[PDB]
Amino acid sequence: GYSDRVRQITLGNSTITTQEAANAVVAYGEWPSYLDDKEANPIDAPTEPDVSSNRFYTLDSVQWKSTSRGWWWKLPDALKDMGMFGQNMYYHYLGRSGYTVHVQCNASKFHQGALGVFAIPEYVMACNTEAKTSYVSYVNANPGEKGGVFDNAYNPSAEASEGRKFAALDYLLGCGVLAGNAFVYPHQIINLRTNNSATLVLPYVNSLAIDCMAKHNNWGLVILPLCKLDYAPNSSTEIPITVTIAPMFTEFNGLRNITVPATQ
């Protein structure tokens, strides 16, 4: 009766079902966990918000078209405005979190296409001016739940002030490496003939036990159309991709007044 295709995930007051999954990935074979006393750093008693924040938050959906080049988000950035997770994040200097990432995209037995879904530690991307290096604004690096998109062209700016955004060039993974090698990162593929969802469970990954969430994104989430969407009755059709993410084993230190980042 039980199947690699059928799964339920419950966190807090939220549950996901899927009937066309393809197993699930646990990044680097490691489930998230709380920070042990023998690896701890800040000494204040941490806040562990548990069910208030460790639950599924669904981002605005994006549309997959035959011309789409792909999508990216950063974490914890994408969830910074999400319920009590966002509040705990911004009221504290330090935070750590794992995640369950659930990417959703259904179609029909007559559609075709394949999405690569990658979780990338320290997903540093190229800037869009050749007058400077590493020249990206905080606002452009941290778009929040809207994330960003890839392009198949690189057109760096004429003036440095106008190029302070990512050059998210698809085939170079926005960072000077070939996209065909992205499979070295934890990943699944949503191949429409096979499955309608991808599930990745991510431990906290960093060179530190805990860090400043408002300064530093630990993971990138990349969705690339490896094989273009095609549907014979209407090649211009669009199907939604929906991203739902739950923080896990969240832990925060260094409580004070709330952080309100710059918006422009």
Partner 1 sequence: GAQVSSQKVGAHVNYTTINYYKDSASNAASKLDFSQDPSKFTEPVKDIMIKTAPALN
Partner 2 sequence: PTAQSTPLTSGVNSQEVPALTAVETGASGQAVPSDVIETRHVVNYKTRSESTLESFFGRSACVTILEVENFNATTDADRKKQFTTWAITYTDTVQLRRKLEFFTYSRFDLEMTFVITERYYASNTGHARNQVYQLMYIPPGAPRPTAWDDYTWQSSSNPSVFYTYGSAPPRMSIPYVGIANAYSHFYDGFARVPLKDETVDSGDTYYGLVTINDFGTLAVRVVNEYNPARITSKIRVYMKPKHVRCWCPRPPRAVPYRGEGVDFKQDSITPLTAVENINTF
Q: Between 76 and 95, how does the x/- string for binding to Cl ion read (CB under 5 A)? A: -----x--------------
Task: Compare residues 158 and 177 and give the one whose CB is closer to partner 1.
Answer: 177
Q: Which is nearer to partner 2, 17 or 63 (CB)?
A: 17
In contact, 173 and 179? CB cutoff 8 Å: yes
Confirm or reject binding of residue 48 to Ca ion (CB under 5 A): yes
User: Cβ closer to partner 1: 148 or 220?
Assistant: 220
Told to check if 5 binds partner 1 by CB under 8 A, we report yes
C-alpha distances in Å from residue 187, one per residue of 25, 26, 156, 194, 199: 7, 9, 30, 16, 9
Q: Is 130 annotated as a binding residue?
A: no
How close are the terminal C-alpha atoms of the chain, in Å? 54
For residue 95, what are its two tokens? 């935070």
Two tokens, residue 248: 């896990």
Q: Shortest Cβ contact with Ca ion: which residue?
A: 48
Q: Which tokens is 228 given?
A: 């273009």
Judged by CB under 5 A, the chain residues 136 through 155 that form the site for Cl ion are 144-145
Site string for partner 1, 30-59 (x = CB under 8 A): x-----------------------------
If one asks whether residue 175 binds partner 1 (CB under 8 A), the answer comes out as no
**Among Cl ion, Ca ion, partner 2, none, residue 48 binds (CB under 5-8 Å by kind):** Ca ion
3-state SS of 2-55 is: CCCCCEEEEECCEEEEECCCCCCEEHHHCCCCCCCHHHCCCCCCCECCHHHCCC
Nearer to Cl ion, 78 or 229 (CB): 78
> What is the footprint of partner 1 within residues 7-26 (CB under 8 A)?
22-26
In the list 152, 208, 230, 235, the residue contacting partner 2 (rule: CB under 8 A) is 208
Q: Taking CB within 5 to 8 Å according to partner kind, which of partner 2, Cl ion, partner 1, none is near residue 176?
A: partner 2
Question: Would you say 145 or 151 has its CB closer to Cl ion?
Answer: 145
Q: Are the C-beta atoms of residues 101 and 199 closer than 8 Å to each other?
A: yes
145 annotated as ligand-binding: yes
Q: Between residue 128 and residue 157, which ones bind partner 2 under the rule CB under 8 A?
A: 130, 132-139, 141, 154, 156
Dihedral angle of Cα 209, 215, 218, 219, to the nearest 10 degrees: 170
Beta strands in 67-218 (DSSP E): 71-75, 92-104, 112-121, 148-149, 187-191, 197-202
Q: Whole-angstrom Cα distance, residue 27 to residue 186? A: 5
Angstrom CA distances, 124 to 32, 121, 129, 167, stand at: 23, 9, 16, 11
1 binds partner 1 (CB under 8 A): yes
Q: Does 20 bind Ca ion (CB under 5 A)?
A: no
Binding residues: 48, 145
Q: Which residues bind partner 1 (CB under 8 A)?
A: 1-6, 22-30, 184, 186, 194, 201
Q: Which residues bind Ca ion (CB under 5 A)?
A: 48
